[PDB]
Every structure is written in structure tokens, then in C-alpha cells.
Amino acid sequence: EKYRSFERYRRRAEQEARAPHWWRTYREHFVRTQKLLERKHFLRELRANVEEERAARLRTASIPLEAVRAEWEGPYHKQRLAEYYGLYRDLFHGATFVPWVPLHVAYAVGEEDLIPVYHGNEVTPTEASRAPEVTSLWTLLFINLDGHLLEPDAEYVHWLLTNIPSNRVAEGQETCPYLPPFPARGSGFHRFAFLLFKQDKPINFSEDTRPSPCYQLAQRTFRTFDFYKRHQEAMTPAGLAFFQCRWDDSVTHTFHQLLDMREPVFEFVRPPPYHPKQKRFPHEQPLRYLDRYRDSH
Amino acid sequence: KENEAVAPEFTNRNPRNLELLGVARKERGWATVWPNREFWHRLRVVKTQHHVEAFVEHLNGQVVVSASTREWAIKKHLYSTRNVVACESIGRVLAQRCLEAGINFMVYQPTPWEASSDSIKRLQNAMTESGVMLREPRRIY
Amino acid sequence: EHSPEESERRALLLKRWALFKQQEHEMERDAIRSMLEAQQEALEELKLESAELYAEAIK
RNA sequence: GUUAAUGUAGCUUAAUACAAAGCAAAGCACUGAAAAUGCUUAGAUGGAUAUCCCAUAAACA
Incomplete structure (x- = not known):
């Protein structure tokens, strides 16, 4: 058969290139x-609706998009963003977990509104002057994945709460007091990720307790993987929320x-x-x- | 002061740090192949026999944001999976998913007939009003 | 110039006309297969009794 | 009843998860024809489980 449109060849060619082959290729x-069954019943009702048919032929139909977002929410798609931005590799040394609790966070600005914190969002450090609002007995940790200034693997905490009763976070122990974002200049976008871990049993995290107030970077530095490994038996992450901040x-x-x-x-260092x-x-x-070799010529 | 201690060079591990800054590498090869590969992300619109789907795909071929009328949430409020209005809705929904994903820039390369299609034009109108850019920023060398 | 009601009335009959034709095409396609299957099924039946008879028939 | 078939929409072991999917296929517009192209049309678990099951249709009967 011969392709009757360029796209047919292009789509097959694009698919053909994607698939690996025995011969060497660029990829x-x-x-x-x-x-x-309930969904199918709605389809029949939606299709049968004469008004909807008329709108389609009149190209005037509309949708309540807000409903779509709620119904779409989400675990599988939420994981993609975290994996795409490299949270799992930096936070769990490559362990990937499907978030099942629809965790949502927003940085409270004044009192009129609270700035959302999407997955991959950008929020300026100025807007993060105060701690954000986060929405059984679990924990919750804050991270500066690439906000560290000295060691690549190391990262800093904004504030760490332990033994969070049910969902109410006010009762969680303030192991680490809140710190506003401090991303270094010239490094572009720093990714900060918010993690929610299932707490099988209440355990005193005396090791993770930090003085309040604490303003020392030497003590704010930590590793998520070893911290999670020490508690990996009773810790299974389920919630994700991360944003980017510039200088x-x-x-x-x-x-x-x-x-x-x-x-x-910081800035790219040029060679000698x-x-x-x-x-x-x-x-x-x-x-x-x-003459040719020398500058004069 | 302990805080003052800082390494001579920063260690940024964000995959999109260079892409967001604009310094990330764009494929400048494939001079013998069309179209150009100088795009970090591309909008892939697939119109099936009974469904219309739109995706935002990276150079590697992995979709980061996927919007399909196959998805339960959109279809229940959407009369017919194949329709001009459906193209607008999926574009607006694709934008909202792009809004969810944090992706603001994209490169769209419609085909001659696809560009002429009014539904795809309205879908492009859906993307621009939602703020999603059909053109990515140029790379920085 | 046709009125919107006239176009709406005409729009409906085209849908009815298209529905009738597509039903006819589906029935017609099945008729081709059914007769072909019966004709092919007919070929097998006599072959069992006597293959020599078809020798003249196939010509 | 014994053997045996046959039980997602032309096709597919697409799928039972986040969708009953992809593909074949249609009407109208565009006037050599066709194709391309734009707008649009009709659709299914007859049914379960990790083999029974009833329906159906055969050799045994």
C-alpha cells in the first residue's frame, strides 16, 4: 500500500524511528x-440529548471545566511531574511511588488569597515570606533539593513536622522552624518538593529534632534518603507538591x-x-x- | 559563621534549570530531516476515528502533559469525542493540564491540512487564551 | 434564502437519509459476505460427494 | 445429554487499570472521476470468574 497523505508516512516514520532496531540509529x-457501566449509561444519555446534538452542529457547545479537573484527579499523572523534575532521584535515590492522597499546597499571601503551589510551579521567594498551608496520623517534611550551596547531595529543610495527628498540622511537633526560601543567585530555578509520608506508628524522631529557632546551615543540611531509610519501615510516601523559585x-x-x-x-566558570x-x-x-602565526598579518 | 561556608560552584540538579534559563541544548542536527528539532517540547494532536487527543511531548518522545477525550472527566461533560468544539475543549483542558504541570512554553508545528482545519485553529485559540505559548523561547549559547 | 427553521428541518432529513443509507450499506456488505459464504459453503458440500462433478463446473 | 464448537462493533488477546481502546469503515461539502481536504454520521462486553455458564450451532445424538 502507498500512503495517500504525507502524515501517514510521517506518523509511521515517527513511530518507526521511536522503536529500537538491530541496525545502529540515532535513538x-x-x-x-x-x-x-455507569459511565456508559451517561454516554448514551449524553449522545441521545437532542440539545447537545444541536449545539455540536451549531458549534456552540460548552463544558463545565472545573468539574473535569476534580473528576480527573490524578495519582498516575501526579507521579509523572515529580519523576519528570527529578524529585525521586534526588529524594529517594530513584525510588518511585505513585502518590495516592491528592496533596495540594499553597503559599499564603496576605489574607485575600493563598498562592497555589502546583507540580512544577514557579513561586518567588518574596511570596514565600511565611509558611504555606498544606491540605491519618502521618508526617510531613520540607526540602531544598538544589538550594544547597556547598554539597550537591545535601539539602536544607524549611520546616519538618512529625506525628501529625490525623490531618490537623497545628499539633505536629515543630522539629524544624520555618525558614523563607534562600535560592542562590545565578543558579536559575531551584526546585523545592513537599513530601507526605504515611506513618505506620507514632515514633519519636529525636534524631530529626532541631533547635527552635535554628539559623545554622551546618545543622539544616540533611539527606532525605538516609532519613527515609532509617524510617522506611514505617514511612511510605503518598503526597507530592513542588515549586520552583528564582533569586x-x-x-x-x-x-x-x-x-x-x-x-x-554563582555563574558558569570559563576555562583558562x-x-x-x-x-x-x-x-x-x-x-x-x-606573520600568519602571529597576530600581525 | 558556619552559614557563610559555601562551595565555589553551585550544584543545580533540576532537569529544567537549563531549559527554563534557556541554556539547555536543542537538537541542531538532522539538517537532512524535516522538520527542525530545535524545540524542547512539542504539541502532538492525534485525531482518531472516534476520539481526538492532544499531547505535549519532549524531544525524548515521552509525553509530560497528555490530554485525551478518552479521559473520563472530560468526556462526561463533552458531547462527542470527535467534534470541532471537542478540539477547543481538549486544548483548554490540555492547557489546564499544562497549567498543572508547570509547562508554559511549547512548539506547535501543524501540518498543511491540520493548520487549515478550523477545529485545530480554535484549539490554538484555546491554547493562547489559556496562556500556553505555541512557540518556545530560543536557546542560549 | 432558507430560514434557520428550514435549514433545521433539512438538517434533520439528511440525518435520516444518512442513517438509512448507512444501514443499507451495512446490510449490503453482510449480503455480499453471506452469499459468498453460502457460495463457498456450497462449493464444499458437493466436493465431498463427488469432486469430478465440479471439474466441469469450475470451467 | 456425550464430544465439540461460540459469547467486545468489519478487524484485534486493545482493555479489564487510569479508557469498553485502536484500526477498518460512513454522510455532506469541494463539481472532470478518484484521491486529498473541511465539517460531520452509526456503533459492542447477549456472559462469568483465576473452566463452568446459559444462549446459539454442528458430529455423536
Whole structure:
């Protein structure tokens, strides 16, 4: 058969390229049931509706999109964002968990509204002046995955709560007091992820308790993997929420006022200049040949 | 002061840090192949016999944001999976999923007939009003 | 110029006309298969009794 | 009744999970025809479980 449109060849060609082959190619080098029956009944009703048919032919139909979002929510798609941004590799050394509790967080700004914290969202450090609102007996931890200034694997806590009764977070132990974001300048977008871990039994995390207030980076540094490994028996993550933050004026305030340190500033480091090595005695070297080699020409 | 201690060079591990900054590498090869590969993300719109689907796909071929009328939430409020209005809704829904995913920029390369289709044009109108950009920023060298 | 009601009335009959034709096409396609299957089934029946008879028939 | 078939929509062991999917296929518009192209049309678990099951249809009968 011959493709009657370019797309037919393109779609097959695109699919063909994606699939691996024995010959070398670029990619290898560089790379419940009851509910459905109820759903089917709605389809018949929706299709039968004469008004809906008229709207379709009149191209005037509309949708309550807000309902779609709630019904769509979500576990499988929520995992994609966390994995896509590299939370799992940095936070659990590659362990991947499907979030089952629809965790949602927002940074409270003033009193009129609270800034959402989507998956992959961008929130300025200024807007994060105060701690955010997070919505059985579980725990909850805050992380600065790439906000660390000295060690790559290490990361800093904003605030860590343990033994959170049911859902109410006010009763959780404030092991780590809240700290505003402090992303270094020149490093682009820093990803901060919010993790919710199922707590099988209430356990005193004396090891993770930190002085309140604490303004030392030497004690804020920690590792999620080893911390989770120590509690991995009773800890199974289920909630995810992470945003990106750039440098901002508030960051200077955080680094100086309470962190009490000079603001970190970074940029791509260029290689040392390349210098040709001329010969001390240019034996049998004319000026015309040296003229091309030297700057003058 | 202990806090002052900082490494000479930063350690940023965010995959999209370079992409968001614009310094991430875009495929500049494939000079003998069409179309250009100088896009971090692409909008893939698949119109099946009974369903219309739109996706946002990275160069690697893995969809990050997927919007399909096959999804239960959209269809229940959507009369017919194949329709001009459905293209608008999936674009707005795809945008909302893009809003959920944090992806603001994308590269759309419609085919000659696909571009001429009014439904796809309205779907593009759905994306622009939702703020999703059909054109990505240029790479930084 | 046709009125919107006239177009709506005409829009309905085209749907009825399309529905009738598609039903006819589906029935027609099944008729082709049923007769072909019966004709192919007919071929097998006599072959069992005497293959020699078809030798003239197949010509 | 014994053997044996046959029980998602032309096709598929697509699927029983987050969807009853993908594919074949249709009407109208566009006037050599066809194709391409735009807008649109009709649809299924006759049924279970991790073999029974009834329906159906055969050789035994």
C-alpha cells in the first residue's frame, strides 16, 4: 500500500524511528468495572440529548471545566511531574511511588488569597515570606533539593513536622522552624518538593529534632534518603507538591538577616585562556610564515 | 559563621534549570530531516476515528502533559469525542493540564491540512487564551 | 434564502437519509459476505460427494 | 445429554487499570472521476470468574 497523505508516512516514520532496531540509529546512541457501566449509561444519555446534538452542529457547545479537573484527579499523572523534575532521584535515590492522597499546597499571601503551589510551579521567594498551608496520623517534611550551596547531595529543610495527628498540622511537633526560601543567585530555578509520608506508628524522631529557632546551615543540611531509610519501615510516601523559585530581593534578606551570611552568587566558570607556545629560537622560520602565526598579518 | 561556608560552584540538579534559563541544548542536527528539532517540547494532536487527543511531548518522545477525550472527566461533560468544539475543549483542558504541570512554553508545528482545519485553529485559540505559548523561547549559547 | 427553521428541518432529513443509507450499506456488505459464504459453503458440500462433478463446473 | 464448537462493533488477546481502546469503515461539502481536504454520521462486553455458564450451532445424538 502507498500512503495517500504525507502524515501517514510521517506518523509511521515517527513511530518507526521511536522503536529500537538491530541496525545502529540515532535513538540508541542518544537514548472499577461497575463504574464503567455507569459511565456508559451517561454516554448514551449524553449522545441521545437532542440539545447537545444541536449545539455540536451549531458549534456552540460548552463544558463545565472545573468539574473535569476534580473528576480527573490524578495519582498516575501526579507521579509523572515529580519523576519528570527529578524529585525521586534526588529524594529517594530513584525510588518511585505513585502518590495516592491528592496533596495540594499553597503559599499564603496576605489574607485575600493563598498562592497555589502546583507540580512544577514557579513561586518567588518574596511570596514565600511565611509558611504555606498544606491540605491519618502521618508526617510531613520540607526540602531544598538544589538550594544547597556547598554539597550537591545535601539539602536544607524549611520546616519538618512529625506525628501529625490525623490531618490537623497545628499539633505536629515543630522539629524544624520555618525558614523563607534562600535560592542562590545565578543558579536559575531551584526546585523545592513537599513530601507526605504515611506513618505506620507514632515514633519519636529525636534524631530529626532541631533547635527552635535554628539559623545554622551546618545543622539544616540533611539527606532525605538516609532519613527515609532509617524510617522506611514505617514511612511510605503518598503526597507530592513542588515549586520552583528564582533569586529575589527577599533572598538577600533571608541570607543576611537570619541566615547571617553573605549572599551566594554563582555563574558558569570559563576555562583558562589558551596561549600558543612560541619557540624560543625560530630556526629557519621566515617572517611570512611567522606573520600568519602571529597576530600581525 | 558556619552559614557563610559555601562551595565555589553551585550544584543545580533540576532537569529544567537549563531549559527554563534557556541554556539547555536543542537538537541542531538532522539538517537532512524535516522538520527542525530545535524545540524542547512539542504539541502532538492525534485525531482518531472516534476520539481526538492532544499531547505535549519532549524531544525524548515521552509525553509530560497528555490530554485525551478518552479521559473520563472530560468526556462526561463533552458531547462527542470527535467534534470541532471537542478540539477547543481538549486544548483548554490540555492547557489546564499544562497549567498543572508547570509547562508554559511549547512548539506547535501543524501540518498543511491540520493548520487549515478550523477545529485545530480554535484549539490554538484555546491554547493562547489559556496562556500556553505555541512557540518556545530560543536557546542560549 | 432558507430560514434557520428550514435549514433545521433539512438538517434533520439528511440525518435520516444518512442513517438509512448507512444501514443499507451495512446490510449490503453482510449480503455480499453471506452469499459468498453460502457460495463457498456450497462449493464444499458437493466436493465431498463427488469432486469430478465440479471439474466441469469450475470451467 | 456425550464430544465439540461460540459469547467486545468489519478487524484485534486493545482493555479489564487510569479508557469498553485502536484500526477498518460512513454522510455532506469541494463539481472532470478518484484521491486529498473541511465539517460531520452509526456503533459492542447477549456472559462469568483465576473452566463452568446459559444462549446459539454442528458430529455423536
